[PDB]
Amino acid sequence: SLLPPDNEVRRKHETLLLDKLYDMGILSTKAKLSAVEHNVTVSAFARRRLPVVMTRLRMAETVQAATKLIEQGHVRVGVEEVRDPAFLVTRNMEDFVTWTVGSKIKQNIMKYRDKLDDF
Amino acid sequence: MLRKQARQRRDYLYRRALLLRDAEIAEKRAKLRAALASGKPLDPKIANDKELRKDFDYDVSRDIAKEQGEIDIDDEYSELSGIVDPRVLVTTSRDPSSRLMAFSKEIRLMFPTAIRLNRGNLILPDLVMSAQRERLSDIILLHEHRGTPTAITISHFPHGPTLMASLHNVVLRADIPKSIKGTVSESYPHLIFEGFRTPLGQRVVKILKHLFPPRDPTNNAKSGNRVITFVNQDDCIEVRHHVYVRTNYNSVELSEVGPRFTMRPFSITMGTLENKDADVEWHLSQYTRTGRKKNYF
Amino acid sequence: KPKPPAPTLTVVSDVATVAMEDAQPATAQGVAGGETSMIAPQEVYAPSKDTAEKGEVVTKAGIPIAKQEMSREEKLRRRRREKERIRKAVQSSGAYKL
Amino acid sequence: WSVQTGQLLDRLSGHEGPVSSLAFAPDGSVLVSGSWDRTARIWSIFSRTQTSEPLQLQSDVLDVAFRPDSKQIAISTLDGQLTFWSVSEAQQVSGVDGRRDVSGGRRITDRRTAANVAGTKNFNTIRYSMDGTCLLAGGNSKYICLYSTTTMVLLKKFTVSVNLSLSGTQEFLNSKLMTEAGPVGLLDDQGEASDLEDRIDRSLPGSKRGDPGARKKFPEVRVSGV
RNA sequence: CGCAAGGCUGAAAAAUUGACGGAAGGGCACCACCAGGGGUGGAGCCUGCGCGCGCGCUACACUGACAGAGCCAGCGAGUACUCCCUUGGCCGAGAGGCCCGGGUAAACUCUGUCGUGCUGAGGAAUCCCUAGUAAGCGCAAGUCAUCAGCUUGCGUUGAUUACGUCCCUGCCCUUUGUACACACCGCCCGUCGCUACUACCGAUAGAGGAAGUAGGUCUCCGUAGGUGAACCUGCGGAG
RNA sequence: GGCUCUGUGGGUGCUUGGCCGCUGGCCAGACCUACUUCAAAGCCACCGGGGGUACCUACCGGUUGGGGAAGCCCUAGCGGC
């Protein structure tokens, strides 16, 4: 913000900063350096952590339940399991955080929907 | 993947509402920037809004870049505007007749990066699924009355808008003899538009001209021999497909090769073809007191 | 999303690939390996119009051809190829009547 | 892309997920992709008709490899099983579920038994031998397996590291190493250091892939390439 | 309010970059070849478009008729939906309501009875089509434009033949650019325009016409001078 | 006879002793407080962002009164610069 407004490197790095933060899901928009000035927040990073983002994705009921689950090692993201409850899911991995392969949780969901394929 | 498309649609709509709020603000910030470089006195609420002063000192530069046109608006097309070649498929309705099949082939010839697919027994969610699976840019339906087309539904992908339009005064390619017509020249066509001034007209011009491949800009003003025209009068957009040769510096000869339509748009939905429950953007307001006096586009 | 690409240049020398390697007592390359000069003949010399002599021109194949020795038809055809490339990119009463 | 022109040739598509393994055929006529939409794709490019034959699997694809004599393909999926397909008639000709055959685990910071632990029970990378009869498979585990491709039995298993300083190199830890406050290889022991450059903890929180901090105490063992 | 708002006048270029091609070499195309399939075009019905033309619909027999038995779908729920119009009669002072007459599949499978019998599957041409595609089959809905002579959905049964080739018919692009290693390739061609210069031709220094070319360090000593013991400089000598 | 719980020992990594003022001793312990010539080299040492600085603190440059290490000189001293 402190650079003069007409400066090419200011504009390029503003668009770069906003694009990087929006792809990492901290911000909500990509058009306001003011939103970077008083919206980037340790609370925003904390809600981009794994148990709260799976709470929003409704994997678990509460954030405590999600932390207990992924400490038991039920939750992969992509193809690798995750045992650290501090993994920061970005906006491209939110579409891939799922359960692990032979999970008792996956079996219980399948048994609720009565589609339990035992093969 | 379908999770990703749903996520992007929700995030785009949320960013749209955020842009609505921020534009309601930035109408007031621009008076501050103009009053600064001029010295005309301004409103006291603008002058004493302290949060506006802090946020203004932060975000001068984006308003100035928008003034210089360096940046683009949050849109469904500005992501992939002229980098890729937007390929497009055309299908018919469930049971096509022979003249509708020939007409679909005619417009598949009109768009130089188009492919045609038979419907047969192809459920419409599976159609949208397959299009999002093979990264198609746009999809087109056609509805016949009896061998004569009556409706197009230009649907953009992955989650863009649809334009549902009714057709009239159509003449098909496949009625004139082959001795007079021939194989149509597949070249990257120019496009000319006439009569669009409103934001709705600009929206239609964008979602129409983003079906054609982008032209090489080094000698576009002189080369190229095929042009496609969209003119509107009383919001019934009429379109022809001409192919021309420039016999002089001050005269050109035309030759009409494609079909003629006067399509009238009766819906534009912010949401794709499968989403009948998508939020509409404009529909043909009939049965009102002045829906026939008002002229959109 | 990694980065937008930005032009970065790196200068290479004429020193051998055995000067490009890392520090070790004897090289892993043989006796043929060690004479490859890390730059091609195309870069150590390339005939081009900016490095021709005065009267002569260099052709597309890299053969110097003299403007004196060229016949007229060769000059005409070469001018045509250059043009094709460039295209691709009150008076007196007596003075009136007589 | 093509290598002699330098520009992008095309963008193949048809995958409902990220592609995760690729393989060209050694005769130079077939591409094979394998992607997290539980599918493999026999791409035929170099002919005049670019076609894509699909192969439906049960789970995510993690590795693809070709036999040297190019008629056979092997794909390793997320269940932990290898399925051997024939590239002419795209039919599965063999299969081995080697989850038990590769399961070796109990990393520290894991409250599952090494038997029940998921994430170490697959094959990350497989390769064919140069004869054409011995497949080699390696996953995120202590064991590298070496199967045969005709009899489909476990010819030989290897253990990659008897090193106890790495994490998952024995499948049963002991109550001597477990104290009252969690495992004794988990207490942050940086504080009793004499050098400030070793005392500073410039780690980033929740960074599974590499960070310049790289606390890196007891790294995981993983057979990342074979 | 002022300017705009006074008619040598009377309808049907640029170019040192430009105009048009030719030859070779590529790539693509059910508007191309190749193999097959299917329409329309024969008879009748009608919407539509300009008596004619197509688009759909129906009918036309081995793929048969009749009778039994068994067995399969999916999308669909606005206190809402009904095909008529009438002969009579009941109860209706009158307007009506009653009662009686007249005009969740198709398919498929299995099992038997009978036997080709106005009880005839579409010319020249032209168009389309390559995997849940052609084709057969019915059910639902009627969504501000279009559509009941129909339209759009939805399920069911589901093949033959290519999946190569630029030979024919075409379309596009290379012969300039846009990236460097290995590796290869090696000055495509024609007719003019425009420009600079050169001279020429003929009417009145002059506008046109026609044409071509583009290598003495160190130490010591003897000196002379400097600021003198010493110390510095220069020179001449020995190591 | 069975389920459940609870406790003890061994194992879950390749087998060289218990202790101390450890080249010797002790597991019953023994002796107890001596010995001494000259303080020290410097640097570095993680607090979230923008912002004020009256006070305190850090750093730099000074100012009055004392203070005199060290250096220099020679009339030699209670010296002189």
Side-chain angles (χ1 to χ4, degrees), chain A residues 1-5 7 9-18 20-22 24-36 38-60 62-79 82-83 85-93 96-113 115-119, chain B residues 1-21 23 25-26 28-42 44-48 50 52-54 56 58 60-62 64-66 68-69 71 73-78 80-105 107-193 195-248 251-275 278 280-297, chain C residues 1-34 36-49 51-52 54-55 57-98, chain D residues 1-9 11-15 17-36 38-62 64-68 70-88 90-96 98-100 102-187 190-194 196 199-200 202-210 212-214 217-226:
Chain A
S1 48
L2 212 49
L3 282 184
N7 207 4
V9 65
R10 164 187 172 132
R11 212 158 308 113
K12 283 182 184 179
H13 284 67
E14 170 209 286
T15 55
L16 270 189
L17 180 69
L18 275 180
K20 183 65 66 72
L21 290 194
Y22 177 68
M24 284 182 60
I26 299 96
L27 294 171
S28 46
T29 173
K30 37 180 170 176
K32 286 180 78 63
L33 199 62
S34 42
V36 183
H38 48 77
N39 198 11
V40 73
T41 301
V42 62
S43 174
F45 279 65
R47 100 200 58 175
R48 286 319 291 193
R49 291 166 46 92
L50 180 53
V52 196
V53 79
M54 69 196 290
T55 285
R56 186 167 93 263
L57 291 184
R58 295 281 76 202
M59 297 288 159
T62 85
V63 55
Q64 284 87 1
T67 306
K68 169 197 298 296
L69 279 196
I70 78 183
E71 185 183 303
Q72 269 151 29
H74 277 148
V75 173
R76 75 183 211 232
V77 47
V79 288
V82 163
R83 275 159 301 262
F87 178 75
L88 192 135
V89 161
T90 172
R91 213 182 276 263
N92 291 99
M93 288 313 116
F96 297 137
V97 45
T98 77
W99 304 105
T100 194
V101 44
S103 170
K104 202 74 175 57
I105 299 298
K106 196 57 187 164
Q107 284 200 23
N108 283 343
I109 296 159
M110 289 297 117
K111 196 175 300 178
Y112 175 80
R113 298 169 73 216
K115 296 193 308 169
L116 178 64
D117 181 305
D118 263 331
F119 173 66
Chain B
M1 180 253 293
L2 314 171
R3 195 179 325 216
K4 198 195 92 167
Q5 308 302 353
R7 184 190 50 82
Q8 259 173 35
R9 186 170 49 84
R10 278 167 286 159
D11 286 10
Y12 167 65
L13 296 190
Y14 183 45
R15 281 181 298 121
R16 187 166 203 82
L18 256 184
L19 179 49
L20 176 50
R21 295 177 184 169
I25 293 298
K28 196 187 310 169
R29 185 176 63 234
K31 292 183 196 322
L32 180 58
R33 183 188 54 105
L36 262 190
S38 48
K40 173 231 284 181
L42 78 160
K45 321 285 168 223
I46 314 178
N48 293 141
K50 178 177 180 291
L52 184 149
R53 255 198 269 173
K54 273 299 306 201
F56 158 76
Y58 278 116
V60 172
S61 172
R62 197 171 185 273
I64 283 182
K66 273 155 70 51
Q68 311 315 303
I71 46 185
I73 194 174
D74 285 9
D75 212 336
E76 294 84 297
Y77 299 93
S78 280
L80 268 185
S81 71
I83 321 166
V84 305
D85 314 329
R87 55 190 310 180
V88 60
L89 64 81
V90 52
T91 72
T92 47
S93 55
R94 179 55 79 113
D95 186 344
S97 317
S98 162
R99 255 170 84 174
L100 180 61
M101 218 183 273
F103 168 67
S104 154
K105 183 165 156 190
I107 69 175
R108 192 226 68 82
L109 280 164
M110 186 164 76
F111 304 147
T113 179
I115 61 180
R116 186 201 36 86
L117 280 192
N118 300 308
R119 282 291 306 276
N121 302 130
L122 199 58
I123 166 170
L124 195 54
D126 200 343
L127 192 59
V128 173
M129 176 87 47
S130 52
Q132 270 191 5
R133 201 183 63 208
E134 267 173 303
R135 318 278 170 275
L136 299 166
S137 162
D138 296 85
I139 210 166
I140 296 167
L141 270 179
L142 296 165
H143 313 329
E144 47 177 44
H145 168 41
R146 273 174 77 184
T148 163
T150 49
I152 58 158
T153 76
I154 310 284
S155 169
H156 194 65
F157 278 120
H159 46 84
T162 60
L163 185 143
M164 296 196 256
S166 164
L167 281 89
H168 312 260
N169 306 343
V170 55
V171 280
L172 311 95
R173 180 68 184 280
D175 266 348
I176 46 183
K178 189 184 283 292
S179 313
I180 279 180
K181 69 163 153 78
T183 64
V184 58
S185 75
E186 174 264 337
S187 161
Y188 283 176
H190 289 137
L191 275 74
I192 53 174
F193 290 84
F196 307 84
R197 45 214 62 181
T198 83
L200 213 59
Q202 298 315 303
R203 179 71 141 187
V204 173
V205 161
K206 204 185 308 171
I207 77 170
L208 276 173
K209 86 184 177 88
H210 272 272
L211 268 70
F212 301 82
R215 204 73 205 278
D216 200 295
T218 188
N219 207 357
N220 66 330
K222 292 183 181 179
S223 173
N225 285 158
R226 154 200 192 170
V227 61
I228 296 179
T229 163
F230 296 85
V231 305
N232 61 346
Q233 301 98 1
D234 284 347
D235 74 1
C236 315
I237 169 170
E238 184 137 9
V239 47
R240 283 91 170 84
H241 170 208
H242 278 98
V243 46
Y244 69 104
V245 62
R246 188 185 296 223
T247 183
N248 211 342
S251 86
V252 72
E253 290 303 90
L254 286 173
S255 76
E256 195 172 7
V257 73
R260 316 170 80 181
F261 320 133
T262 168
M263 55 177 77
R264 39 176 317 175
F266 62 90
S267 172
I268 288 174
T269 83
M270 186 190 38
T272 177
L273 169 60
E274 81 210 302
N275 272 320
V280 295
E281 191 163 349
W282 179 90
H283 45 258
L284 188 89
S285 157
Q286 266 184 0
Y287 315 104
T288 74
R289 281 215 74 256
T290 61
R292 36 164 195 162
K293 291 189 209 79
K294 271 200 78 54
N295 203 343
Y296 307 101
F297 311 145
Chain C
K1 275 183 62 78
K3 254 163 183 175
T8 77
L9 73 158
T10 171
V11 305
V12 301
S13 278
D14 181 66
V15 302
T17 66
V18 196
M20 189 40 68
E21 322 294 354
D22 215 329
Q24 59 161 352
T27 170
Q29 287 180 13
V31 69
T36 71
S37 165
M38 215 171 78
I39 54 174
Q42 285 109 8
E43 290 112 6
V44 78
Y45 182 70
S48 87
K49 65 177 289 272
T51 172
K54 192 185 189 310
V57 310
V58 288
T59 182
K60 204 188 183 191
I63 296 180
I65 295 307
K67 265 198 183 159
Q68 193 81 21
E69 72 170 285
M70 267 161 63
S71 158
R72 283 159 299 128
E73 57 86 13
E74 293 291 330
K75 276 197 198 161
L76 175 67
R77 288 202 296 230
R78 280 196 88 264
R79 189 171 193 159
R80 261 156 203 182
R81 296 294 87 78
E82 278 313 290
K83 193 134 72 55
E84 183 199 9
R85 289 185 191 85
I86 288 185
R87 180 207 299 268
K88 272 184 196 298
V90 59
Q91 282 184 359
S92 173
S93 300
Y96 275 124
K97 268 272 289 195
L98 308 186
Chain D
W1 304 262
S2 84
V3 84
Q4 60 203 29
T5 77
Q7 299 183 312
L8 188 148
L9 191 82
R11 294 191 193 84
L12 299 197
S13 41
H15 276 296
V19 293
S20 201
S21 162
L22 264 72
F24 263 89
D27 54 358
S29 83
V30 189
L31 187 46
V32 171
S33 45
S35 62
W36 291 350
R38 307 176 163 80
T39 185
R41 279 284 178 98
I42 311 290
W43 290 99
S44 182
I45 322 172
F46 303 97
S47 315
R48 286 201 195 260
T49 50
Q50 285 183 359
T51 81
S52 46
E53 211 187 341
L55 312 176
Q56 175 75 23
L57 305 194
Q58 317 195 0
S59 87
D60 294 86
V61 186
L62 260 73
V64 184
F66 265 108
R67 200 193 182 103
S70 91
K71 279 95 187 174
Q72 198 181 7
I73 172 177
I75 44 180
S76 155
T77 181
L78 186 142
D79 297 356
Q81 40 170 348
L82 309 165
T83 84
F84 288 66
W85 299 72
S86 197
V87 81
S88 81
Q91 287 259 11
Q92 165 180 12
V93 311
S94 279
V96 166
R99 317 165 32 103
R100 182 52 188 97
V102 83
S103 197
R106 191 173 268 276
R107 277 86 79 208
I108 307 100
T109 78
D110 191 315
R111 301 185 62 88
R112 302 267 275 261
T113 324
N116 298 333
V117 53
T120 178
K121 278 184 155 175
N122 44 1
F123 297 131
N124 284 302
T125 319
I126 68 174
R127 282 300 176 207
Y128 272 71
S129 156
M130 275 319 124
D131 49 42
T133 42
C134 322
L135 190 134
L136 199 149
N140 203 336
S141 173
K142 197 177 59 173
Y143 303 128
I144 280 178
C145 279
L146 184 68
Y147 293 107
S148 156
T149 75
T150 70
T151 183
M152 315 301 302
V153 309
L154 194 147
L155 261 183
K156 199 158 175 53
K157 201 192 300 184
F158 308 111
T159 63
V160 291
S161 93
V162 292
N163 191 355
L164 194 48
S165 176
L166 316 177
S167 76
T169 77
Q170 49 175 16
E171 64 281 359
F172 285 115
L173 282 75
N174 44 356
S175 316
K176 274 171 163 189
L177 281 202
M178 176 175 160
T179 82
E180 188 266 305
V184 83
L186 283 205
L187 299 172
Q190 291 188 18
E192 58 275 25
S194 43
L196 190 92
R199 265 208 302 272
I200 58 153
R202 186 61 266 174
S203 197
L204 289 168
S207 59
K208 299 290 105 184
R209 193 61 73 88
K217 294 185 186 295
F218 288 3
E220 274 148 24
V221 50
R222 39 172 315 160
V223 182
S224 157
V226 283

